[PDB]
Amino acid sequence: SNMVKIVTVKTQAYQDQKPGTSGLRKRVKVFQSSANYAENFIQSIISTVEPAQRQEATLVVGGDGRFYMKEAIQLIARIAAANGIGRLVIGQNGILSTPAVSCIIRKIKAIGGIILTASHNPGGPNGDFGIKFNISNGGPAPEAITDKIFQISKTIEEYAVCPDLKVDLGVLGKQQFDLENKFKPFTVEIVDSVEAYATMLRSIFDFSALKELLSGPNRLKIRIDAMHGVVGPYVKKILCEELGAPANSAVNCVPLEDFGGHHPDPNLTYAADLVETMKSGEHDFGAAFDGDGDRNMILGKHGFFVNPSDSVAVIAANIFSIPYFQQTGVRGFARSMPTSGALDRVASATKIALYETPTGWKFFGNLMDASKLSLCGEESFGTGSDHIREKDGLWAVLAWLSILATRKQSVEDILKDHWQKYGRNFFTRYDYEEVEAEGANKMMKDLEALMFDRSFVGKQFSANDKVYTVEKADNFEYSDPVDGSISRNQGLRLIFTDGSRIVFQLSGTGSAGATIRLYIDSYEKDVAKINQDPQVMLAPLISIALKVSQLQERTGRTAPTVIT
Ligand SMILES: [Mg+2]
């Protein structure tokens, strides 16, 4: 029935529904086995909306397809309706990529959106589930709002719900629900999952150029792996149906509730199938996305790996191959501090501002909203532009395809030319996982004290054959030029006179300990060095980093858990 009663349900608050910067993430079993866990959190989000503004408000709702998503969406509809939210816009089958949500919020001027995703984390009956809140600029809810949600969730005693309301998520169009003893209806609009996002890309890129690139016998041959996650139908409808790439181009492009039993996390080992396909030499270009579509990995012929720090620098260096930037101009470049300095070389040469921010969306969003930021990158497979207010993996792929079309060179030849022009920033990230937090903190504090001494700047480190000289050493701090906030203790930086850096970060302590992240950025300009093996060229600075930090002595680790 489309005539439904509003009911108040007494509930018991939980104490741990703290939404963080990427949403509340708990095991699926937690959501299923804890009474009113989901309901409490959804009500807490909706209670941040002024009652007077609810009727004219729209919330965009969708997710990455993982197990439990549709049940969660039904809960959101039932609770939003009962709370006087006038309208929901929901992707068909509940499916919306995180970039598509950002796109739709900004296009229709919604007050925000609720995204059902835990991004790269596994899904399924034994997997993870996540609930993310975005606000009216299409971006993540900032700390002041997530703080309020948390506060509400810890003392909630009741929520409002229409228990009999049920949305058909499979059929396009407007469904209206008349609420008992409420004058105005509740409206749900089911939209095609891809349409608005594709229409946005169709304006950003030259689809005629891309169709020519991707179709015919002389076509660029691509393999695009959605990793069984949300971007699948976007690949099929945009790259295959509209742009004419053959259907076999679309890899793992049917969304699965368990992401096929694997982590939808794009890197060389979680996307090993794509890497092996690329190794055969048949395809010119490959790419992988994470579960909600805001991260991307870029591959060339034979499985040549474009590391994400280089990827954003290449896009910057060929940015006017993309029609969007021909019209906006380039307002600025940015990277998170641990990302390699490759982008900086391009920005310096082209005389464009480079903003080096702490890790976190808010810093990019602030600069984009100031019209100071066109292109951003993170070493963790993140690339974006100010076209929306989330990173966007498929966008980054179409950027690469636009560049390939104008340059008429292989991926690898473009990188080789880039390194020859700008020098090469060899780059790796070492993750030491589940380390004992007390020894790891001791490592960091002892190293910070070493770096703070007056004599540390100017110290020399040898390989030997080569001398690295400390130019600067600190614990990174950032004063945000838009919101005035000061972010402190954002990472230990060893900055060397030759353009190289070592960066140490220590994560928060989880149930199994903390993660030490060690970033090595070694700059080389010599033609005899820029095409050598990266782990060989990085080995001297890796040795210096392990020696100065005494990491093995403090943690007992002789090797990182993961190398990227
Ligand atoms: Mg993601």
UniProtKB/Swiss-Prot annotation:
Its cofactor is Mg(2+). Phosphorylation at Thr-469 by PAK1 significantly enhances enzymatic activity. The modification N6-acetyllysine is found at K18, K351. The modification N6-succinyllysine is found at K421. One of its GO terms (molecular function) is magnesium ion binding. Mg(2+) binds at S119, D290, D292, D294. Changing Y422H: In allele PGM1*1-, allele PGM1*2-, allele PGM1*3- and allele PGM1*7-; phosphoglucomutase activity is similar to wild-type. GO terms for cellular component: cytoplasm; cytosol; extracellular exosome; extracellular region; ficolin-1-rich granule lumen; tertiary granule lumen. The keyword Repeat does not apply. Changing Q43R: In CDG1T; reduces solubility; increases aggregation. Changing L518P: In CDG1T; decreases strongly solubility. Catalyzes the reversible isomerization of alpha-D-glucose 1-phosphate to alpha-D-glucose 6-phosphate. The mechanism proceeds via the intermediate compound alpha-D-glucose 1,6-bisphosphate. This enzyme participates in both the breakdown and synthesis of glucose. It is linked to Congenital disorder of glycosylation 1T: A form of congenital disorder of glycosylation, a multisystem disorder caused by a defect in glycoprotein biosynthesis and characterized by under-glycosylated serum glycoproteins. Congenital disorders of glycosylation result in a wide variety of clinical features, such as defects in the nervous system development, psychomotor retardation, dysmorphic features, hypotonia, coagulation disorders, and immunodeficiency. This is Phosphoglucomutase-1. It comes from Homo sapiens (Human).
